[PDB]
From a paper:
We purified BFLF1, the ORF68 homolog in EBV, from transiently transfected HEK293T cells. Interestingly, size exclusion chromatography and negative stain EM revealed that BFLF1 forms decameric rings, consisting of two stacked pentamer rings. We determined the structure of BFLF1 by cryo-EM at 3.60 Å resolution and found that it forms pentameric rings that are comparable in size to those of ORF68 and with a highly similar structure. The BFLF1 structure is highly similar to that of ORF68, with a Root-mean-square deviation (RMSD) of 1.09 for the monomers and an overall RMSD of 1.95 for the pentameric complexes. The internal core of the protein, including the first two zinc fingers (residues C54/C57/H132/C138 and C316/C319/H386/C393 in BFLF1), is structurally highly conserved. Small variations occur in surface-exposed loops. Residues 180–240 (corresponding to residues 178–219 in ORF68) and 264–278 (corresponding to residues 244–258 in ORF68) could not be resolved, suggesting inherent flexibility. This flexibility also prevented unambiguous modeling of the putative third zinc finger, although BFLF1 residues C432 and H469 can be modeled, and C214/C215 likely lie within the immediately surrounding disordered region. Homologs from the gamma-herpesviruses, BFLF1 and mu68, were able to partially complement loss of ORF68, although not to levels comparable to ORF68-expressing cells. While we found that ORF68, BFLF1, and UL32 are all capable of forming pentameric rings, the significance of further oligomerization (e.g., the stacked pentamers of BFLF1) remains to be determined.
In contrast, despite observations that UL32 and its homologs in HCMV (UL52) and KSHV (ORF68) are essential for production of packaged virions, their function in packaging remains unknown. We reveal the structure of KSHV ORF68 and its homolog in EBV (BFLF1), which adopt a novel fold and assemble into homopentameric rings. The central channel of ORF68 is lined with positively charged residues that are necessary for nucleic acid binding and production of infectious virions. We hypothesize that the viral genome is threaded through the ORF68 ring, and that ORF68 acts as a scaffold on which the terminase assembles for genome packaging.
Residue numbers in the entry:
A (entry chain D), B (entry chain C): 3 to 179, 241 to 263, 279 to 484
Write the structure that this text describes.
Amino acid sequence: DFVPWTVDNLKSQFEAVGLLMAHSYLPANAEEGIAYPPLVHTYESLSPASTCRVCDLLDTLVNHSDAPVAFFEDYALLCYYCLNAPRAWISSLITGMDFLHILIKYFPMAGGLDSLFMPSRILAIDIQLHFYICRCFLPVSSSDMIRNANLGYYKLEFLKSILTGQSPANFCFKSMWTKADYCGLLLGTWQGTDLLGGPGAELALAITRPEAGDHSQGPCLLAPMFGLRHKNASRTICPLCESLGAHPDAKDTLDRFKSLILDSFGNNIKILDRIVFLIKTQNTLLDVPCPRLRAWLQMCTPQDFHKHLFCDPLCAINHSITNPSVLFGQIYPPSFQAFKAALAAGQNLEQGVCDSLITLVYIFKSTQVARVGKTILVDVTKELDVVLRIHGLDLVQSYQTSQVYV
Amino acid sequence: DFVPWTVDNLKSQFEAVGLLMAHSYLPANAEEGIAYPPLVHTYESLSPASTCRVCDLLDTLVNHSDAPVAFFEDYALLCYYCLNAPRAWISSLITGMDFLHILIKYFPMAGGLDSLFMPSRILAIDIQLHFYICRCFLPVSSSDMIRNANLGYYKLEFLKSILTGQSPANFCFKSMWTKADYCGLLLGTWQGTDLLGGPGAELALAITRPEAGDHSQGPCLLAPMFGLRHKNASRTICPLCESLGAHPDAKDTLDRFKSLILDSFGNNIKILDRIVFLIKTQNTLLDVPCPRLRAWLQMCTPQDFHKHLFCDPLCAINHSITNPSVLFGQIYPPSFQAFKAALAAGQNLEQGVCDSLITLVYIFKSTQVARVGKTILVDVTKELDVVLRIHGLDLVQSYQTSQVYV
Ligand SMILES: [Zn+2]
Ligand SMILES: [Zn+2]
Ligand SMILES: [Zn+2]
Ligand SMILES: [Zn+2]
């Protein structure tokens, strides 16, 4: 009956997504003012000795009387879907909305599920920290909590570094270490600087904005970079990584585009020039089925295509971990209950990507965004190169894409 | 019908070469003034995320209707010639003029081919960046754009370093890494300080000069060093490397001169002394056929002969890559169309020199001209020595020729 990533489950809860997207703007003034509640709650959530608020809520609910069965099955299904989504803005939003839907469905007698997304309660950074960064649902053996704890320390330290804007104090790298789109939601909001492209029922109902925060950067705190800075006409919220999660025909379109770039030229023209030419003269952003897709896609600067396709490591992880047949595909009903039960017992939740790889990617993005020295950059670049080559990817040398794009 | 390096194709387009040589003077005042248009356009062209203007023009022309055939054949012929020319001033000028000739011939309905060489359009640095530095016409396999992109980043960074006058900020070397002469054109212009030698229809029609720029350094921005600085009576525009490209009997004359130096002495006299004696007492710069050649050659200080013949690496690359039989020799007509067609399909365009070698040479010239530390100079010297010895050359140790000549 319930299946995640169904747009209806989000279209019927606008009173909640409004409050979520309203409590996730960065402060308007550069200086915090007096004390911006979302930022202080986030800084408390990234503490090294704090408790995951999602797990805390789950235990204060389930460990009461008569926790209904099939709740663990719906939770396992939501976790299986979040295991196959790109780390981006639309993914966090959809996960939050579907989590709230499950809670309102099965546990109606709970206390404050009508105001869940407020400070001192579950917010966006908590949803990310539970479902995507340091996932808290994969089955693990008892003798395997040590390496995970250590990598968790490094993860959280460098995330706090990304957020605060200054590299960690004490760290030397060496000697350490369902068929329905969402494009209306993306195009509806995001009238800030997130497009900068050529020009510049979801769209109608996606019009609201707060005032206490910077309404030019948009809902940053949902993104996996906690901000929107841009250099050389490339930004820290890759819109292609939203398209990967907001439409079924996006990953295949980008694969076809990459094949065209690689194969439709014989000269030694630089790849950015190939992209600019394929987009400019022989328009390949018109022969796309959805009007909203190619309307939100033809307003992406070619530097962004270059970054996403050939340069950035996080975009490669997204492009290689998503699976739009699971997010926008029906499941054989005769096997549905069997699959639900198998997930409840923890049988198919495959890790996906490694954990050292994610920590290394976050370290790299931290040194790419915030300030950094030299002897750490030149070394994290080499290590990222070797690890990415091992794991089965092929991107340009990382020093270039660390000094050119942001 | 059309063949490159024919002096007639340049003698009939003086209204264009005048504007090209007028828009390529360094600014008169040391400080830019307000904003010197050529310099700002160049700084935009050496950006790490910009588009090659030559390829952009070629696509905005050819990818329109009825791009005539045999245009790709003439373009392939021009590229084959530029594949066999010395990196110098006369080479860039001739390539620009012949490119404009081809464009005016085949694409007459184009928009502004009468004012092509203006700022915000094709200029000299763009011609160099297309035809000589990071050549954009060699056929390459699809799986070979990565190493090329990385080397391109380093190339452009250190070229910008040569131009701006300060070494790159973030760089640690270790842990990284047709029978008709042109001599009238050279002797006609270049009444600045480019000769400093003994004394001090092309020449008649080579008299024009702008006023907004430094008319003492001459058209620097065509050279491969973007300036004319000189130390110890040796300059950064090697005139011998112009002779290599402006006369058929130049490479053989210099080879004979080198053989005389090496073989006509038994004592242990230093090589600069051998040069000074061979030029002074037993004049060997009179028994030269062309009057213009030995008139423009006997005004070259012996330090310059020494540099070009035995010391500098770029001059060795020039002396070993040029091929004056291709630039000043007729082709067997029964095979002309076959050769043109074979070039159009990309069959004979051999790379020539490596790409790491060119990047290393530019790094060396950058540290030789601009400011630099120590731990980078002493190491690039060793690496250049080893690479040059591998590639089949024999020059003096590079530290000396880095501290003595400029
Ligand atoms: Zn948790
Ligand atoms: Zn992306
Ligand atoms: Zn080019
Ligand atoms: Zn020379």
